[PDB]
Scaffold this motif. Structure first.
Motif, PDB file in Angstrom:
ATOM      1  N   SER A   1     -85.124   5.128  -0.341  1.00 15.42           N
ATOM      2  CA  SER A   1     -85.143   6.478  -0.957  1.00 15.42           C
ATOM      3  C   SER A   1     -84.004   7.340  -0.395  1.00 15.42           C
ATOM      4  CB  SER A   1     -86.467   7.142  -0.733  1.00 15.42           C
ATOM      5  OG  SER A   1     -87.522   6.378  -1.299  1.00 15.42           O
ATOM      6  N   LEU A   2     -83.739   7.272   0.914  1.00 14.48           N
ATOM      7  CA  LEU A   2     -82.578   8.032   1.443  1.00 14.48           C
ATOM      8  C   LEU A   2     -81.284   7.367   0.961  1.00 14.48           C
ATOM      9  CD1 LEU A   2     -81.342  10.140   3.317  1.00 14.48           C
ATOM     10  CD2 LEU A   2     -81.709   8.579   5.220  1.00 14.48           C
ATOM     11  N   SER A   3     -80.341   8.144   0.425  1.00 15.40           N
ATOM     12  CA  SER A   3     -79.017   7.582   0.047  1.00 15.40           C
ATOM     13  C   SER A   3     -77.918   8.451   0.668  1.00 15.40           C
ATOM     14  CB  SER A   3     -78.867   7.499  -1.445  1.00 15.40           C
ATOM     15  OG  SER A   3     -78.693   8.795  -1.999  1.00 15.40           O
ATOM     16  N   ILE A   4     -76.923   7.854   1.328  1.00 16.76           N
ATOM     17  CA  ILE A   4     -75.795   8.698   1.823  1.00 16.76           C
ATOM     18  C   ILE A   4     -74.504   8.234   1.136  1.00 16.76           C
ATOM     19  CG2 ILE A   4     -74.509   9.452   3.852  1.00 16.76           C
ATOM     20  CD1 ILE A   4     -77.358  10.419   3.948  1.00 16.76           C
ATOM     21  N   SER A   5     -73.792   9.140   0.461  1.00 15.40           N
ATOM     22  CA  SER A   5     -72.476   8.799  -0.142  1.00 15.40           C
ATOM     23  C   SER A   5     -71.417   8.693   0.956  1.00 15.40           C
ATOM     24  CB  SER A   5     -72.056   9.822  -1.146  1.00 15.40           C
ATOM     25  OG  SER A   5     -71.599  10.993  -0.484  1.00 15.40           O
ATOM     26  N   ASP A   6     -70.356   7.912   0.741  1.00 15.14           N
ATOM     27  CA  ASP A   6     -69.252   7.933   1.741  1.00 15.14           C
ATOM     28  C   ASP A   6     -68.662   9.347   1.730  1.00 15.14           C
ATOM     29  OD1 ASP A   6     -69.959   5.282   2.057  1.00 15.14           O
ATOM     30  OD2 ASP A   6     -67.957   4.464   1.645  1.00 15.14           O
ATOM     31  N   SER A   7     -68.046   9.777   2.829  1.00 14.91           N
ATOM     32  CA  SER A   7     -67.548  11.137   2.948  1.00 14.91           C
ATOM     33  C   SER A   7     -66.362  11.368   2.022  1.00 14.91           C
ATOM     34  CB  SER A   7     -67.133  11.429   4.387  1.00 14.91           C
ATOM     35  OG  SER A   7     -66.043  10.613   4.778  1.00 14.91           O
ATOM     36  N   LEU A   8     -66.124  12.634   1.706  1.00  9.64           N
ATOM     37  CA  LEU A   8     -64.870  12.998   1.070  1.00  9.64           C
ATOM     38  C   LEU A   8     -63.724  12.713   2.039  1.00  9.64           C
ATOM     39  CD1 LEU A   8     -65.692  16.326  -0.812  1.00  9.64           C
ATOM     40  CD2 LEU A   8     -65.421  14.019  -1.731  1.00  9.64           C
ATOM     41  N   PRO A   9     -62.553  12.315   1.542  1.00  7.12           N
ATOM     42  CA  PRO A   9     -61.476  11.901   2.448  1.00  7.12           C
ATOM     43  C   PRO A   9     -61.100  13.005   3.425  1.00  7.12           C
ATOM     44  CG  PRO A   9     -60.988  11.238   0.205  1.00  7.12           C
ATOM     45  CD  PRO A   9     -62.187  12.134   0.128  1.00  7.12           C
ATOM     46  N   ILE A  10     -60.840  12.604   4.665  1.00  2.00           N
ATOM     47  CA  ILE A  10     -60.515  13.534   5.739  1.00  2.00           C
ATOM     48  C   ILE A  10     -59.009  13.748   5.763  1.00  2.00           C
ATOM     49  CG2 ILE A  10     -60.717  14.006   8.201  1.00  2.00           C
ATOM     50  CD1 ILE A  10     -63.366  13.944   6.749  1.00  2.00           C
ATOM     51  N   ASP A  11     -58.595  15.007   5.865  1.00  2.54           N
ATOM     52  CA  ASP A  11     -57.177  15.311   5.959  1.00  2.54           C
ATOM     53  C   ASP A  11     -56.609  14.727   7.250  1.00  2.54           C
ATOM     54  OD1 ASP A  11     -57.738  16.787   3.676  1.00  2.54           O
ATOM     55  OD2 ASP A  11     -57.895  18.680   4.774  1.00  2.54           O
ATOM     56  N   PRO A  12     -55.444  14.077   7.198  1.00  2.00           N
ATOM     57  CA  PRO A  12     -54.873  13.498   8.425  1.00  2.00           C
ATOM     58  C   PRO A  12     -54.560  14.528   9.494  1.00  2.00           C
ATOM     59  CG  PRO A  12     -53.840  12.569   6.467  1.00  2.00           C
ATOM     60  CD  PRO A  12     -54.654  13.738   6.004  1.00  2.00           C
ATOM     61  N   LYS A  13     -54.457  15.803   9.113  1.00  2.00           N
ATOM     62  CA  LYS A  13     -54.207  16.880  10.107  1.00  2.00           C
ATOM     63  C   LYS A  13     -55.399  16.974  11.071  1.00  2.00           C
ATOM     64  CE  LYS A  13     -53.296  21.887  10.284  1.00  2.00           C
ATOM     65  NZ  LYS A  13     -53.198  23.118   9.496  1.00  2.00           N
TER      66      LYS A  13
END
Length: 54
Positions: A1-13
RNA sequence: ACGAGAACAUGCGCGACAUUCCGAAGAACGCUGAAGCG
Protein backbone atom coordinates in the motif's frame (compact mmCIF):
# COMPACT_ATOMS: atom_id res chain seq x y z
CA UNK A 1 0.00 0.00 0.00
CA UNK A 2 2.87 2.46 0.70
CA UNK A 3 4.40 3.68 -2.61
CA UNK A 4 7.41 6.05 -2.90
CA UNK A 5 8.23 7.68 -6.31
CA UNK A 6 11.92 8.28 -7.16
CA UNK A 7 12.90 11.87 -6.28
CA UNK A 8 12.82 14.78 -8.66
CA UNK A 9 16.34 15.26 -10.06
CA UNK A 10 18.73 17.05 -7.71
CA UNK A 11 20.55 20.12 -9.00
CA UNK A 12 24.31 19.45 -9.18
CA UNK A 13 24.87 22.72 -7.26
CA UNK A 14 23.46 20.92 -4.19
CA UNK A 15 26.11 18.15 -4.30
CA UNK A 16 29.45 18.39 -2.50
CA UNK A 17 32.08 16.07 -1.07
CA UNK A 18 32.07 15.63 2.73
CA UNK A 19 34.51 13.85 5.09
CA UNK A 20 33.02 11.40 7.63
CA UNK A 21 34.30 11.84 11.21
CA UNK A 22 33.86 9.00 13.68
CA UNK A 23 33.32 10.14 17.26
CA UNK A 24 34.37 7.57 19.88
CA UNK A 25 34.34 10.30 22.55
CA UNK A 26 36.67 12.29 20.24
CA UNK A 27 36.68 13.49 16.65
CA UNK A 28 38.79 11.31 14.38
CA UNK A 29 39.62 12.07 10.73
CA UNK A 30 39.35 8.97 8.56
CA UNK A 31 39.73 8.17 4.84
CA UNK A 32 36.00 8.67 4.28
CA UNK A 33 34.93 11.13 1.60
CA UNK A 34 31.50 10.81 0.01
CA UNK A 35 29.38 12.84 -2.41
CA UNK A 36 26.45 14.16 -0.38
CA UNK A 37 23.54 16.52 -0.84
CA UNK A 38 24.35 19.77 0.94
CA UNK A 39 22.23 20.87 3.88
CA UNK A 40 19.25 23.12 3.20
CA UNK A 41 18.30 21.13 0.09
CA UNK A 42 14.66 20.19 -0.48
CA UNK A 43 13.85 16.87 -2.17
CA UNK A 44 10.44 16.06 -3.64
CA UNK A 45 8.81 12.62 -3.67
CA UNK A 46 5.26 11.50 -4.52
CA UNK A 47 3.67 9.09 -2.01
CA UNK A 48 0.44 7.08 -2.60
CA UNK A 49 -1.22 5.04 0.18
CA UNK A 50 -4.59 3.37 0.70
CA UNK A 51 -6.94 4.57 3.41
CA UNK A 52 -7.56 1.10 4.85
CA UNK A 53 -4.04 -0.11 5.61
CA UNK A 54 -1.87 2.98 6.19
C1' A B 1 -18.63 -86.83 -76.13
C1' C B 2 -19.29 -83.72 -68.15
C1' G B 3 -27.05 -79.22 -67.97
C1' A B 4 -22.79 -78.57 -71.46
C1' G B 5 -20.01 -74.69 -74.69
C1' A B 6 -18.28 -69.91 -74.90
C1' A B 7 -19.35 -65.19 -71.25
C1' C B 8 -14.01 -59.77 -66.92
C1' A B 9 -19.18 -58.18 -61.36
C1' U B 10 -18.03 -54.86 -64.88
C1' G B 11 -18.80 -49.16 -66.65
C1' C B 12 -19.03 -43.89 -64.71
C1' G B 13 -18.07 -42.13 -60.79
C1' C B 14 -12.26 -36.67 -55.91
C1' G B 15 -13.72 -39.11 -48.68
C1' A B 16 -15.54 -34.31 -50.18
C1' C B 17 -18.00 -29.57 -48.51
C1' A B 18 -18.28 -25.51 -44.06
C1' U B 19 -14.64 -24.74 -40.05
C1' U B 20 -9.20 -18.82 -37.02
C1' C B 21 -6.24 -24.57 -32.00
C1' C B 22 -8.94 -19.71 -30.03
C1' G B 23 -11.24 -17.24 -25.53
C1' A B 24 -9.70 -14.85 -20.45
C1' A B 25 -4.89 -13.76 -18.20
C1' G B 26 0.49 -7.03 -15.52
C1' A B 27 6.89 -11.28 -15.15
C1' A B 28 5.30 -8.89 -10.12
C1' C B 29 5.18 -9.48 -4.62
C1' G B 30 8.28 -8.01 -0.66
C1' C B 31 13.37 -5.98 -0.65
C1' U B 32 17.24 1.76 2.28
C1' G B 33 23.98 0.32 -1.18
C1' A B 34 24.15 -0.62 3.61
C1' A B 35 26.78 -2.10 8.70
C1' G B 36 31.37 -1.72 11.74
C1' C B 37 35.51 1.70 12.12
C1' G B 38 40.00 1.23 12.16
Amino acid sequence: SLSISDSLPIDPKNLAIYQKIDINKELKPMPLYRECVNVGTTVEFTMKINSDDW
